[PDB]
């Protein structure tokens, strides 16, 4: 939801075209009282309480909570036997069929989220294999998230990714209050 | 709109077994979008319900209402198609099993009234439907006699139970 921006918008009675004049006098006509042909009661009138403009749903959970969510997701995968650690993502060939057959043979899920340390160092073979697959998705370590971890039945991590995640997530524990954004220089923070 | 009446002439029944009563022929015909009120047409339709084809034509030939001529044309067309296409042996051996008038698609026109006010006229249109069944017209339902009517009363007496008890 935090990325969500709904673009639904309706016209209020102010913004509907026309509808300036009083349709007919207050009294004598025998008809109901009205003040413009674009009030919500009228066909073609404005929407009384509609979606108003592009609306953001943005909000930030505490970064400690989000890191805890990542930790909980990892624990859940490990406990439910959906987490598999690889020494490396190198494949004998870049053929997607090999990867699918390997997953089927090892009884992985219908969907596998492979994670590698950085975008640049990801082996070309696995890159080619996963570029043509829909349920085998390959992401860098920095892209790991609860949503994709849950969407994919099995989570495949490399050892460097495991070390990287341990470091980053444990850092959230045992850190001070931020004096200023962590992007700024700190004594011991890369 | 609905055009089921036309389709009713196209239903083919399975061939009858020799030891089976001869199924009477049935001819459905209609005239759509008659410039006439369905309410006025209803009286003519009711008039000719249950009458033989010849009797209905005779009654309509001497009726002053505009709808009578239209109904007569429809009946004559129905008779012609009954002979040509529905294997009816005798023209006159037909009776009006069903005859009804239906609302047509109408047009709205303005009637100017006296003080800059107006009304909405309806250029009314009606449909007319007939089913012609082969055979003599079924006899009119006899008026119930005192004997039968007292028989019904005594049956109602005998049907009585002791209500709200064992």
């Amino acid at each position: 939801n935090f990325k969500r921006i709904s673009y639904a918008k309706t016209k209020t009675r102010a913004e509907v075209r026309g509808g300036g004049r009083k349709p007919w006098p207050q009294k004598g006509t025998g008809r109901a009282r009205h003040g413009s042909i674009r009030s919500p009661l009228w066909r073609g009138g404005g929407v009384a309480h509609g979606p108003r403009g592009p609306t953001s749903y943005y909000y930030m959970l505490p970064m400690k909570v989000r890191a805890l969510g990542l930790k909980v997701a990892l624990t859940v995968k490990l406990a439910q036997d959906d987490l598999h650690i690889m020494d490396s993502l190198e494949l004998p060939t870049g053929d997607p069929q090999y990867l699918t057959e390997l997953a089927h043979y090892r009884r992985w899920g219908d969907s596998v989220l492979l994670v590698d340390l950085t975008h640049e160092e990801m082996p070309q073979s696995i890159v080619e294999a996963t570029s043509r697959l829909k349920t085998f998705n390959l992401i860098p370590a920095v892209g790991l998230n609860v949503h994709s971890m849950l969407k994919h039945q099995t989570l495949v991590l490399t050892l460097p990714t495991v070390a990287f995640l341990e470091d980053k997530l444990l850092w959230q524990d045992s850190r001070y209050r931020p004096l200023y954004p962590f992007s700024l220089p700190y004594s011991d923070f890369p | 709109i609905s055009r089921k009446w036309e389709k009713k002439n196209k239903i083919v029944y399975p061939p009858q077994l020799p030891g089976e009563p001869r199924r009477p022929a049935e001819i459905y015909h209609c005239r759509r979008q008659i410039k006439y009120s369905k309410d006025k047409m209803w009286y003519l339709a009711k008039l000719i319900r249950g009458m033989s084809i010849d009797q209905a034509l005779a009654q309509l030939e001497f009726n002053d209402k505009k709808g009578a001529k239209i109904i007569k044309e429809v009946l004559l067309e129905a008779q012609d198609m009954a002979v040509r296409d529905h294997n009816v042996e005798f023209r006159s051996n037909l009776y009006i099993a069903e005859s009804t008038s239906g609302r047509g698609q109408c047009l709205k026109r303005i009637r100017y009234h006296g003080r800059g006010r107006f009304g909405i006229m309806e250029k009314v249109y009606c449909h007319y439907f007939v089913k012609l069944v082969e055979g003599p017209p079924p006899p009119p339902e006899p008026p119930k006699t005192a004997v039968a009517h007292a028989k019904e009363y005594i049956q109602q007496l005998r049907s009585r139970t002791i209500v709200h008890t064992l």
């Binding site: 007919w24 006098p25 009294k27 004598g28 006509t29 | 698609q105 047009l107 709205k108 026109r109 303005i110 003080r115 800059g116 006010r117 107006f118 909405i120």
Partner: peptide, 16 residues
């Protein structure tokens, strides 16, 4: 006095 209100002509001029 309240003036009469005329309804749009298109509504009553329609034809098949």
């Amino acid at each position: 006095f309240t003036p009469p209100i005329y309804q749009p002509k298109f509504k009553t001029e329609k034809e098949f």
